[PDB]
Design a protein around this ligand. Structure first.
Ligand SMILES: [Zn+2]
Ligand SMILES: [Zn+2]
Ligand SMILES: [Zn+2]
Lengths: 248, 276, 353, 144, 193, 213, 69
C-alpha cells in the first residue's frame, strides 16, 4: 500500500488562497513533485502534509495510521526521527547558534545517542556524504554559503534516515551550476536510499532533473496528474501547456 | 509570632497555596509547579522564592540553618536567620547535624543530610532553557514532549568553545529519570550529592513563582554524554584554616590589592575539621 | 550584583541601635506618638497611604514614625507589611457620586450646581512661615452655615449631557492587578491607573509639569476636584447581600483635556483621571495628567515627551524599586570593583605605555 | 424583606465608633452566651474604583478590614466587616448582628442601640457639613 | 450546622502540612494528625485536617454521596470558603469512601501534558490501612521498599497497580483512617507482590 | 435676575480656618512640637532643609508642622522665607575632609584610611513595622567603643593618587547662582549641582534609577 | 546618591556623550527638577479658568455645529 495517502485535503484561510480537493498516493522510493504558480497554494499543501497545518477537511494516512489522529507528541517525534523537512531558507531549518556538527547531531542526541564521539563521527560522515568538507565541522551555518547551508540542512534531515522528506524548493536562490550540482547530489542520495521525496518547485527544470512523478496545482486544486517526460514534453491540460510555454 | 504580623510573616492564604504547590511538586518530582502568590517586597535579593518556602514549611519546633554560599556568617544569611527568629521564634544552629530546616543559597552542605531534614534552595531561574527559548509557550509543552535534547546543545558546544565542560554552576540534571530540573547555581561539586539523598530537597523561584521538589531517595543524574561522562574536577589546593581539601573551597578577599585565600565554603564542616 | 559579605553582625546591630536612638532623638522631649502623627501630619500620611497601598491612617503614621519621617522608607515599611495580611474581600466599585464632600471645585465654569466648595485647602494662603507654631496655641473656631449638601453632579456628567464629552462607560473588563502579576508593557489603562496611584508623588508631579510646559501637552482643565468620604461595600460569601464596611476619605480629580476630531463622531473633549487616599490632591491631579499623557496609544497620538513614554514613566514610578536599586550600590562590592580596577588598568597600559 | 434592615443595622454598626459602640453595648447590660466560630481576623479589602467615576473598573489600593463571626446558643450566626484593625470592635459588631436576628432583641436593640448610633453619626455628619459649607463660594442670588 | 475547625488554625495547619509532606515525600509511611480531635462525620480526622490545611476558594471540593452531608458542606464552605461541586470532573480535592465507584474515579481530573499539576487529588477514607492485601512500594520517596496492606476497593487497586495515566498525569491518592494517614503519589511504583 | 454678590474673601477665610482646624487635628491629643519633629522626624527635616534651601532644622520642622506634614508645602514655605532674609555673607568653600563623621562607608575599598563606619542607618534592617512604637518606649542603651577618630581622607584621593581617577581641582571660577539670575541652558556644572540640590528627591531618584537601563 | 547619579548623567555634554534617556537631557531634567515650580504650576489648575474654557467651548460648539447638526 502507498506510503502516504491523501484524500480530499482542503484548506482555505482566505478566499481563493490555499488548496482544495487534493488527493494522491505516494509509494516508497518514488519522488513526487508539485508544480504550480505562486498562488497555487502548493506551499500550503506542503505545510499541511508535513504535520504543521491542520486541514479544514480531508484525511492523510501514513502507513496504517491517520496523520492528524496521532497526538502532538507522536507527530513531533515523527517530524524529527522519521520525517525530514527542507525549507527554502536554510536558517529556518538550521539552528544558527549551533555548529554544523551540532546541528547534524541534534537529531541523534534527541534520539538518545549520548555519545559525543559517535555523534561527531556521524556528523563528519554525513558532511562527507553531502560533499561538505569535514575540516569545518565546528564551523557554523552563518559562515557557510547558500549551497553549503542547503547541504548541511539535507545532512541534518537525513541523519535519522527518514523514509519521507519534504523539500519546499531548497534550490531557490542558488546559481545555475550550484543548483544543478545540488540537484545531482539529491538524486544520488535518493537513489542510494529508499526514502520518498516530496519536492515543491516553481520551475519544471528541478522536477525534470530530480522528480519521478509530477502533479500540477492551479488556484488551489489539482489539474492533471503528470509524469516525467510526458507532461513536460506532451502537456495535455491547457494550463499545463501555458506553463510549459512560459518556461520555454 | 512578631507583633502585628502573621507567623512566618506570610498570610495564611499564600502559605496554603505554596503548600499545595509543594505537595504537587513532590508528587511530580522535578516539575516546576506554578503558584499564583502576590508580590512581596524584600530588602535582600535572596528570599523571593526561598523565604516563601521556608515561611510555608517552617514550624515552631524547627531548628533553622541559613546558608549563603555554604557560609552562615554571611550578612544576608545572618539577616534571614534573624528575620525568621523574629517572625517565628525558632531555634537556629550552626551545624548541619542538628538542623531540621536548612535554607541555603547556591550550596548543599558538606555534611550528609539525614532523615527528617528539609533543605530549601533559592532559585533565581527555575527553567534552565530560558537562555535558549524566549517564548514560554513551547517551554511548558516540550517537558511533556520530553524534548530535552535542546539543553544538550550547550553541553555539546561547551567543549567546542572552551575545550572542557565549564558549566560548573547550575548544571542541569534529570530527576526521577523523567524531569529535567536545574537546581540553584550550586557548584558541580555538589551535583552528585543530590543523588538519592535521605532528605527532602525543595527548590523555590520567586521572580518566576515556580516550585519543584526532589523527594528523598529520588534518582537524579547529571546530564552529559557517555563519551564525556559527568566528572567533577578534583581540588588540588587545601583550606587555609583546616587544610583538608575534601570540601569545595570558596575564595575570601583580604586586601584591596587582590590578595585572597581559599577557605572551605561550608563553614560548619570547616569548623568541624578545625576542632578535630 | 551580589557580593557575599561576612563579619558585620556586631557592627550592624550597633548601627541599628544608633539609628533607633537617633529616631527617638533627645529623650527630654516626649515620644512622638502615632495618633499625633496621623492627626497633625495628615498630608504625609495621605501620601504614604496612597503610595504604600494600605488605606489605614494608623499604619501609615506608624511607618512614618519608624522611618524618622522619611516618606520612602515609610512607604517601604507599609508595602512590606501589606504582605502579611490576608485578602479578605474585594469591595464593590466605588461610587464617587455618593461621596460625602469635604471639598469640591471646578475650574471650567464660574459656578456650577452645588457651588465651589473650597473646604480645607492651603490654596490662597500667603506662604509666610508662622512662628507662633513654635509654641502652643488654639485652633480657630469654625464658622457654620447651612448643614446640608446640595446635589453636586460631576461636571463631566454636565459636559457629556451637552455632547461636549463622552461618558466613561463600563465595558465589564476585568481590572488588571499588578499586586498579583508584574506589569507587561503596553498595559491596559486600569493597570496604568493602579501603577500611577502607587507612583512617587514628586516624580509624577514633575512629569505632569513637563507635559504642562509643552513636553506632550494635553491642554488640561481641572474639570472637577472632589475630596470626601466614600462608603466601601463588600458582598461576603457567608451572606449574599452587600454590606457596608465603613468609609474612606479620598480625592478624585477629573481633568478636561484637549478636544479631538474623531472620523465619524462629533468633536469632544478628552479626559484624565486621578484618585488618591486622603485629601492630598496634587497627587491626584498629577495622576490625571499622566493618565491622559499615557492614553496616547488609545488616541493614536505619537509621543513627543517623556511623560507620554509608558515604559519610562511606569518602570520608574515605584519608590520601592528605585530605593532598593540605590541601596544596593552602597553594599560592599569590594570584589567587583577589583575586577573594574584590572579592566581599567589594562586599558591604561594599552593606550598609555 | 429583612435583608434591607439587616444591611442597615450592620452598616450602622460598622460605621459606628469602637468607643461609642462599646460604651453603649456595655450600658445596655445585654449579653447572651456566644462562641466565636471565626476569630476576629484583620486582613485586607481590595479597593475597586471606576475610571472617570463611571467607567471600567481598576484597582485603587487596599484598606484594612477586620471580620469576626459569632454563633449564639440557638445557632444564629452574626458576622461583621469593619474597616480598620479593631478586633474587639468586629467581635462586638458580630455579636450585635447575631442578636438583632433574635426576635427578643430586634425591636429592643433597634430602639436602644442602632437608632441612637445612627442618630449620633448623622448629627456629627451634619455638623461637619455645616462647617464645610461655611467655605462655599457664592456668586449669584435670586432677587424678587 | 457548623463544625469547629482547627483550634489554632495556623500552627495546626502547619503541623498537618508537615505530616502530609512526610507521608507524600515518603510514600507508604503512616503519619498521625493529632491536631484535630474530632472529624466532620462521616469525614474522619485525617480528611478534615487535610481539607482545613489545604482547601480554600481556589480548590473546589467534590464530596461523594455517602460522605456528602449538609453539615459537612456548610462547615467546609464556612471555614475554608472553598467552592463545592457535585461532579468529579471539576473537582480538585475529591473525597470518597471505599464505596468509590470506578466511574467516579475515572472521571477525576488527572492533569494535563502542559499542566500536570492541574488534576484532582483524590482523598480516600478506609476502614483500616494496615490489614489487607500485601502491597510493595518503591520509587521516588522509597529508600528500598515499603510493605503496606491497606483495605482498598478493586477499582483503586487496579488504578494504583495498573496506572493507565502516564506520568506526569495521574491523581495522588491519600488513605485516611481516624487520625492516621498515608499518601501514594502518582510516581510510586506499587506492586501486589 | 441673579445679581452678582461677593463671597470670595469669606470663602477663602473659611477654607483656611478649616485647613488650620484639620492641621490641629483632634484636640484631645497634645499638639506636636517643632522640637519633636526636628528630633524624631529628622529625615523629613533633612529633606525640607535640602530642598527649601535653608540649613535650619528648626525652620524646616516648623515648615513641616505648618504644612501638615506635606513635604512639598514645607519646602515651598522655606523657599518663600528665603526671600524674607538678607544675604549676610558667603562662607568659605566647605572642607568635607575635616568632617566629624557620624557615618562613613565605601563600596569599592575595604581598607579605607580611617576605617569603615556604618553609623546610624536603616541599611540591613528588616522592613517589619515595629508595633511596639504604637505605645511609649525608649531605645536601647547605646554600646560604646574607643572614643578616638582617626584621620579620614577621601577615597577619591586614593583613587586619584593611583592614576585611576582625576582629582577635582578648583580653577578659581566663580560659581553660577540661579537664585540671582534665571537658568540659561546649557548650564555649568556649578549651576547644575545647585539646581540638583534643590531638586525633588523622588524625581531625581527616578531619574537615577532610569539611568540604570 | 540620587543627586550624584543625576549629576553624572548630566555631565554628558562635557564627556562628549549622547543623551540616551531623559535623565541625560539637561533642559528636561533641570527645568522640572524644582519641586516648588512643578507643584505650583500643577496645583494652579485649581484656579478658575472659565474664561479660557469658554473660549474652548465656543470653538468646540462651532466645530460641532459644522461637523454635524
Ligand atoms: Zn576549611
Ligand atoms: Zn552589585
Ligand atoms: Zn492655566
Amino acid at each position: 500500500q502507498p506510503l502516504l495517502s491523501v484524500n480530499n485535503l482542503t484548506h482555505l484561510y482566505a478566499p481563493g488562497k490555499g488548496f482544495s480537493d487534493v488527493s494522491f498516493d505516494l509509494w516508497p522510493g518514488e519522488v513526487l513533485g508539485i508544480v504550480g504558480e505562486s498562488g497555487s497554494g502548493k506551499t500550503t499543501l506542503l505545510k499541511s502534509i508535513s504535520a504543521r497545518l491542520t486541514p479544514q477537511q480531508g484525511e492523510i494516512h501514513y502507513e496504517n495510521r491517520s496523520l492528524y489522529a496521532m497526538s502532538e507528541a507522536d507527530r513531533r517525534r515523527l517530524l524529527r526521527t522519521e520525517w525530514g523537512v527542507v525549507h527554502q531558507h536554510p536558517l529556518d531549518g538550521l539552528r544558527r547558534q549551533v555548529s554544523a556538527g551540532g546541528n547534524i547531531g541534534e537529531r541523534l542526541m534527541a534520539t538518545g545517542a549520548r555519545h559525543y564521539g559517535d555523534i561527531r563521527a556521524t556528523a563528519q560522515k554525513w558532511l562527507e556524504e553531502v560533499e561538505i568538507p569535514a575540516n569545518r565541522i565546528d564551523d557554523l551555518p552563518t559562515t557557510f554559503s547558500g549551497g553549503m547551508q542547503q547541504r548541511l540542512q539535507i545532512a541534518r534531515n537525513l541523519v535519522t534516515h527518514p523514509k519521507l522528506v519534504f523539500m519546499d524548493e531548497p534550490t531557490g536562490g542558488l546559481d545555475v551550476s550550484v543548483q544543478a550540482r545540488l540537484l545531482d547530489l539529491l538524486r544520488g542520495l535518493v537513489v542510494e536510499l529508499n526514502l520518498a521525496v516530496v519536492i515543491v518547485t516553481h520551475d519544471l527544470g528541478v522536477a525534470r532533473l530530480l522528480a519521478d512523478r509530477l502533479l500540477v496545482m492551479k488556484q488551489g486544486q489539482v489539474v492533471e496528474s503528470g509524469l516525467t517526460d510526458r507532461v513536460l514534453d506532451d502537456p495535455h491540460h491547457p494550463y499545463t501547456q501555458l506553463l510549459v510555454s512560459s518556461v520555454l | 509570632n512578631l507583633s502585628g504580623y502573621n507567623f512566618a510573616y506570610l498570610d495564611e492564604q499564600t502559605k496554603r497555596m505554596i503548600r499545595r504547590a509543594i505537595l504537587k511538586a513532590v508528587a511530580i518530582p522535578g516539575y516546576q509547579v506554578p503558584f499564583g502568590g502576590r508580590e512581596m517586597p524584600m530588602p535582600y535579593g535572596w528570599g523571593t522564592g526561598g523565604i516563601q518556602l521556608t515561611a510555608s514549611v517552617i514550624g515552631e519546633s524547627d531548628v533553622l540553618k541559613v546558608i549563603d554560599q555554604g557560609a552562615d556568617d554571611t550578612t544576608n544569611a545572618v539577616s534571614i536567620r534573624n528575620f525568621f527568629k523574629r517572625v517565628t521564634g525558632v531555634n537556629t544552629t550552626e551545624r548541619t547535624d542538628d538542623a531540621t530546616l536548612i535554607q541555603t543559597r547556591h550550596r548543599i552542605p558538606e555534611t550528609p543530610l539525614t532523615e527528617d531534614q528539609i533543605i530549601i534552595f533559592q532559585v533565581p531561574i527555575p527553567e534552565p532553557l530560558r537562555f535558549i527559548e524566549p517564548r514560554e509557550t513551547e517551554t511548558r509543552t516540550m517537558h511533556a514532549l520530553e524534548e530535552y535534547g535542546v539543553m544538550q546543545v550547550k553541553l555539546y558546544e561547551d567543549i567546542a568553545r572552551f575545550g572542557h565542560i565549564a558549566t560548573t554552576y547550575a548544571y542541569p540534571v534529570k530527576v526521577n529519570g523523567r524531569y529535567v530540573m536545574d537546581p540553584s547555581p550550586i557548584p558541580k561539586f555538589d551535583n552528585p550529592k543530590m543523588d538519592m539523598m535521605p532528605a527532602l530537597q525543595l527548590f523555590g523561584a520567586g521572580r518566576e513563582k515556580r516550585i519543584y521538589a526532589v523527594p528523598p531517595f529520588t534518582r537524579v543524574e547529571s546530564l552529559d554524554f557517555d563519551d564525556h561522562p559527568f566528572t567533577v574536577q578534583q581540588w588540588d589546593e587545601p583550606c587555609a584554616i583546616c587544610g583538608s581539601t575534601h570540601s569545595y573551597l570558596d575564595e575570601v578577599v583580604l586586601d584591596d590589592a587582590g590578595n585572597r585565600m581559599f577557605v572551605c565554603s561550608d563553614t560548619d564542616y570547616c569548623r568541624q575539621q578545625s576542632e578535630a | 550584583m551580589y557580593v557575599a559579605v561576612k563579619g558585620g553582625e556586631k557592627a550592624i546591630d550597633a548601627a541599628h541601635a544608633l539609628q533607633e536612638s537617633r529616631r527617638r532623638g533627645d529623650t527630654d522631649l516626649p515620644e512622638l506618638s502615632v495618633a499625633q502623627i496621623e492627626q497633625q501630619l495628615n498630608l504625609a500620611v495621605d501620601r504614604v497611604m496612597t503610595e504604600g497601598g494600605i488605606a489605614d491612617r494608623e499604619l501609615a503614621a506608624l511607618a512614618l514614625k519608624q522611618a524618622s519621617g522619611d516618606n520612602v522608607e515609610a512607604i517601604f515599611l507599609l508595602r512590606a507589611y501589606r504582605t502579611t495580611l490576608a485578602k479578605l474581600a474585594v469591595s464593590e466599585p466605588l461610587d464617587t457620586t455618593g461621596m460625602r464632600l469635604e471639598r469640591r471645585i471646578s475650574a471650567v465654569y464660574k459656578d456650577i450646581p452645588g457651588g465651589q466648595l473650597l473646604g480645607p485647602t492651603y490654596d490662597y494662603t500667603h506662604r509666610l512661615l508662622d512662628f507662633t507654631l513654635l509654641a502652643n496655641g488654639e485652633a480657630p473656631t469654625l464658622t457654620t452655615a447651612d448643614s446640608e449638601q446640595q446635589p453636586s453632579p460631576h461636571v463631566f456628567s454636565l459636559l457629556a449631557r451637552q455632547g461636549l464629552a463622552k461618558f466613561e462607560e463600563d465595558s465589564g473588563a476585568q481590572p488588571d492587578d499588578i499586586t498579583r502579576t508584574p506589569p507587561v508593557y503596553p498595559c491596559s489603562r486600569s493597570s496604568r491607573l493602579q501603577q500611577l496611584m502607587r507612583g512617587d508623588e514628586g516624580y509624577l508631579l514633575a512629569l505632569a509639569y513637563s507635559t504642562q510646559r509643552g513636553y506632550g501637552r494635553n491642554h488640561p482643565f481641572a474639570g472637577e476636584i472632589r475630596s470626601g468620604y466614600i462608603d466601601v461595600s463588600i458582598v461576603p460569601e457567608e451572606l449574599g447581600f452587600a454590606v457596608n464596611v465603613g468609609e474612606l476619605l479620598m480625592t478624585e480629580c477629573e481633568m478636561v483635556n484637549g478636544f479631538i476630531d474623531p472620523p465619524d463622531e462629533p468633536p469632544h473633549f478628552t479626559r484624565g483621571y486621578g484618585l488618591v487616599f486622603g485629601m492630598s490632591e496634587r497627587k491626584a491631579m498629577a495622576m490625571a495628567l499622566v493618565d491622559r499623557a499615557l492614553q496616547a496609544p488609545e488616541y493614536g497620538e505619537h509621543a513627543t515627551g517623556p511623560a507620554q513614554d509608558e515604559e519610562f514613566v511606569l518602570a520608574h514610578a515605584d519608590n520601592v524599586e528605585a530605593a532598593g536599586f540605590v541601596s544596593h550600590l552602597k553594599l560592599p562590592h569590594y570584589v567587583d570593583f577589583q575586577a573594574e580596577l584590572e579592566l581599567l588598568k589594562r586599558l591604561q597600559q594599552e593606550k598609555n605605555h | 424583606a429583612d435583608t434591607a434592615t439587616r444591611q442597615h443595622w450592620m452598616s450602622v454598626l460598622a460605621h459606628s465608633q469602637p468607643a461609642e459602640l462599646a460604651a453603649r453595648l456595655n450600658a445596655l447590660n445585654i449579653t447572651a452566651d456566644y462562641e466565636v466560630i471565626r476569630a476576629a481576623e484583620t486582613g485586607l479589602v481590595q479597593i475597586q474604583a471606576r475610571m472617570g467615576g463611571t467607567g471600567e473598573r481598576f484597582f485603587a489600593g487596599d484598606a484594612t478590614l477586620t471580620r469576626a463571626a459569632v454563633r449564639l446558643t440557638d445557632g444564629t450566626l452574626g458576622y461583621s466587616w469593619v474597616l480598620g484593625r479593631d478586633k474587639q470592635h468586629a467581635e462586638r459588631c458580630a455579636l450585635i448582628d447575631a442578636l438583632m436576628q433574635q426576635s427578643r432583641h430586634f425591636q429592643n436593640l433597634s430602639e436602644t442601640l442602632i437608632a441612637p448610633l445612627d442618630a449620633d453619626r448623622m448629627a456629627r455628619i451634619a455638623a461637619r457639613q455645616a462647617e464645610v459649607n461655611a467655605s462655599r463660594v457664592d456668586f449669584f442670588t435670586m432677587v424678587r | 450546622t457548623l463544625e469547629t475547625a482547627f483550634m489554632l488554625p495556623v500552627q495546626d495547619a502547619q503541623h498537618s502540612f508537615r505530616r502530609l509532606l512526610k507521608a507524600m515525600s515518603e510514600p507508604g509511611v503512616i503519619v498521625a494528625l493529632h491536631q484535630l480531635k474530632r472529624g466532620w462525620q462521616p469525614l474522619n480526622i485525617a480528611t478534615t485536617s487535610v481539607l482545613l490545611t489545604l482547601a480554600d476558594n481556589d480548590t473546589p471540593v467534590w464530596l461523594s454521596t455517602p460522605l456528602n452531608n449538609d453539615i459537612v458542606n456548610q462547615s467546609l464552605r464556612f471555614h475554608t470558603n472553598a467552592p463545592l461541586v457535585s461532579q468529579p470532573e471539576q473537582a480538585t480535592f475529591a473525597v470518597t469512601d471505599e464505596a468509590i465507584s470506578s466511574e467516579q474515579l475515572n472521571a477525576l481530573s488527572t492533569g494535563t501534558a502542559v499542566a500536570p499539576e492541574a488534576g484532582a487529588t483524590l482523598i480516600l477514607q478506609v476502614a483500616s490501612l494496615s490489614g489487607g492485601r500485601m502491597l510493595r512500594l518503591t520509587g521516588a520517596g522509597i529508600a528500598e521498599e515499603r510493605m503496606i496492606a491497606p483495605q482498598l476497593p478493586e477499582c483503586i487497586l487496579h488504578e494504583l497497580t495498573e496506572r493507565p495515566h502516564p506520568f506526569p498525569l495521574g491523581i495522588d491518592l491519600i488513605l485516611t483512617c481516624g487520625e492516621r494517614l498515608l499518601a501514594i503519589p502518582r510516581t510510586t511504583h506499587v506492586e501486589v507482590c
